[PDB]
Symmetry: C3
Subunit: 367 residues, 3 copies
């Protein structure tokens, strides 16, 4: 059954820890500003001190209140609790002072957790887990860190377990539900109702070193369905006329659960998606677009396109439906043991391979 | 105690299954239209295909999503899931196609549940349970199916266990709370504060074949109370003056839990009530009025009176208070084990007879 | 650990019963008026009958509905249920009549709980518990019942366990969070960021007879902190310029959990606080100000300044922040076993003494 081929995947209700996970976008943090996030059940407080983004547990060691209720900073590099003034050093999380009791004997005897942080491609990543952090590149799809590119994205909260997000991203026939998105005609896309594996090389598992993932060779080893038929009659057909754009030549997912749609939502872009667990029933959905650039002008041109088109016409215009689609599955999988009652079909094998690889390679399980 | 005289009634938190239950009104469904309902914990999707109302489980066999999120029909007699296009035959619930993968090998190897449906007197009834359906008439009070009558009603959701609804309907002294309803003077009713059993033939149990139920002979074996006294002083008195109408000559309840008030809310009408479980804490309250008719003209006259008077002046004007009355009992009975702590009095014996009959005859228990 | 030092305090999630607790203010009840309250998990109905405030269980013995849904009284000294008319004697809670069934055999054979009530200093106190009530003075801080004073207050609901309320009131360094309240400059207060115990006599435990409690001698055995320093630099300093008022010379808490701030929020006043449990996660916060008076004129002057100044400028302007401060602790202590994970420091010892005294002297534990 399910609990037999991918047990650790089913156990990772709260995600795979001992992996890097995005928390926010670098531009969300100005010097001295605070941003509260919840990752894999942990409340984290982010801030920028002396130009560097720091991550510390969003909970005071005294009476456990979150600093985010009223975040205070009286000296860059520290955070002070709004309740009794306990002050912590962001570099090591140690209690270095108590504003309400100078010289208190608890100073230097207490500390809270701080997390390793690395900002890459404008994204703030945080290492969650007890192990010492490994290279960030091991937890990202290949190409994400390309130096000759620029990235722009957004994040939002989705009311479903993170796994439903990943499986909604790495699903080659769910695209049927996007057939009426204004982005399809909006960007003159030749968009099929689904992709069906045409041979045994349709899916490739990368399990040699890191990163590890599953790749769907949509453009070479799949058959796209542009027509829907019911009992011998064509009841639906995609629009294939004139000059149309080709997207999604390949789609892949990589541990700890990051999607890569290449190219998408336009031939000149690549779309990455993360589904970071917030709680057992919620996740933070990140959408990041990657554009190849040759200099500052291309960067500026991309930023403008993102603001005027890509973001709202695609990240919302195309993907908004994916949000309620995920949430529509929450009860079944989250409450009714859908993991053992689902009935899959051929195209879902890529998802099965992902669950198997994830169950075998996820560095740490958080239930 | 309770768990000893009517144990199966106490166990039937989610209702008695293997019985017919109303789901909606026939006029709520036009050809191709969809109506989602939840009955005894089961989500059901109703539609009209080729003129006939069909009932199918509102949950896809693939990833369990409900079709009601975005119901699709590309061929009358089928329903297609909005997610990956799995299409089902409404007659048998079998998967007959997959819009995103024509000829997929799962076709014909999967199916979901469909329910027997029977429309009578403008009401859509659905058979819930594993057993094969028996005659509809066995689950309705006598007279409901009278051919020389026409029926009109409404349904609404109530936040209480269904048993609290049934017992609020089949309660001869709770009417005290309706004394100030504008319908009392609105329809010149001689309406008492309560009916107290006057002899041993006040209540009669019908437990021979079907339908089965309990009847209160209010007009001949009960004493109506038109005056409320306290410490020897008359503190309240009903208005008995001029030409007033007499209603509620008899009130009865029949398995699986259907009320019959004869006559009510007017001498020319009979009122039926159903309290179909939605969940363990909610039920769908149906109010159906029956009028004897001699032809099309009488039907039209009834439909007009219903729209202009009966529905809002009585079904709401009189009964609305019954809704919060039921919900006011939810915590006690639903959370504080009120079933074993309640303290009944003589008039409640008709309810005791009903719980006993239901516990012994309910065809199926759904906990 | 905590479970070993103050076990009964940790068990009293729903408060200490067999103690008097405030329910409302006397002026909230006019003759024949009703006020519903929930104390230590019990729903209570208050009313004034023949000039006297009465307290009866807000739940009918018949089908458990609360009278508060629609409180009825047809004879001063009784309460009648809105559902079937069961009527109870407020003096002994016995069923003395049934409006819907005169002479019903259940009359005199049924009864509900009534509570001892005592009004003092404009406050309605109710005795919760199974024991016979003891003197009210045993559950109040010394000075509360002073005959040459007048009291005025307000109450509100707070979303946190009651113990978090008490410990927030009896905390000498949490005042840091109040530094920016408009009441500080509003009443020209010389207000420190915290009070730190300066010697061994800083806290005194009164455990000889009743009332019992812990007293902090702030003005004589504590060191007030008017500056906040971080890594050697003054980052915050209170305003100490000329003619300012001195308050909080002493603060104390007494069983079952009543605070006394002397003087506060002004030198001419004393502030009392109660934190009566509503449920396991909620409490009713009472704030009562005491002013010494010499006659009806002083009473009038106090009532006027309470309305024009004390209430909104202090009870709200100063204390409102204490509400979310308490609630910010609810998850940690209420759901994440904060009682054993908290890490206290020297000033918290007064709270530790209070927990110990309460665990040893609370008359009754309600979990
Ligand atoms: S809870 Fe943070 S200093 Fe007290
Ligand atoms: S969930 Fe219905 S077709 Fe996939
Ligand atoms: S529930 Fe109060 S009289 Fe029936
Ligand atoms: Cl978040
Ligand atoms: Cl369509
Ligand atoms: Cl593990
Ligand atoms: Cl009245
Ligand atoms: Cl059974
Ligand atoms: Cl309250
Ligand atoms: Cl400040
Ligand atoms: Cl005890
Ligand atoms: Fe999608
Ligand atoms: Fe009623
Ligand atoms: Fe405070």
């Amino acid at each position: 059954s399910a609990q037999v081929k991918w047990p650790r995947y089913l156990e990772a209700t709260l995600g795979f820890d001992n992996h890097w996970h995005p928390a926010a976008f670098d531009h969300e943090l100005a010097e001295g500003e605070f941003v509260a996030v919840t990752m894999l059940g942990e409340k984290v407080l982010l801030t920028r001190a002396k130009g560097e983004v720091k991550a510390i547990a969003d909970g005071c060691a005294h009476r456990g209140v979150p600093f985010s209720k009223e975040p205070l900073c009286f000296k860059a590099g520290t955070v002070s609790c709004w309740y009794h003034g306990w002050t912590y050093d962001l570099d090591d999380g140690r209690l270095v002072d108590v504003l309400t009791s100078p010289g208190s004997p608890v100073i230097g005897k207490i500390g809270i957790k701080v997390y390793p942080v690395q900002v890459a491609q404008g994204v703030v990543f945080v290492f969650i887990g007890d192990e010492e952090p490994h290279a960030l590149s091991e937890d990202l799809p290949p190409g994400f860190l390309d130096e000759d590119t620029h990235l722009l994205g957004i994040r939002r909260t989705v009311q479903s377990n993170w796994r439903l997000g990943v499986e909604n991203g790495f699903d080659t026939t769910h695209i049927f539900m996007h057939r009426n998105s204004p982005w399809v005609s909006g960007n003159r896309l030749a968009f099929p109702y689904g992709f069906v594996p045409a041979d045994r090389d349709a899916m490739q598992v990368y399990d040699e070193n890191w990163p590890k993932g599953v790749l769907d060779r949509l453009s070479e080893n799949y058959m796209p369905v542009f027509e829907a038929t019911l009992d011998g009659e064509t009841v639906l057909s995609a629009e294939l006329t004139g000059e149309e754009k080709k997207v999604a030549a390949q789609v892949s997912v990589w541990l700890p659960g990051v999607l890569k749609v290449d190219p998408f939502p336009d031939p000149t872009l690549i779309q990455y998606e993360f589904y970071v667990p917030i709680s057992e029933t919620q996740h933070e959905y990140f959408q990041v677009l990657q554009r190849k650039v040759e200099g500052p002008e291309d960067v500026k041109t991309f930023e403008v396109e993102f603001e005027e088109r890509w973001r709202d016409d695609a990240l919302h215009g195309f993907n908004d439906d994916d949000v309620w689609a995920r949430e529509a599955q929450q009860e079944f999988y989250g409450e009714r043991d859908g993991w053992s009652k689902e009935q899959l079909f051929p195209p879902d094998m890529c998802i099965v391979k992902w669950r198997t690889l994830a169950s075998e390679r996820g560095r740490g399980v958080r239930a």
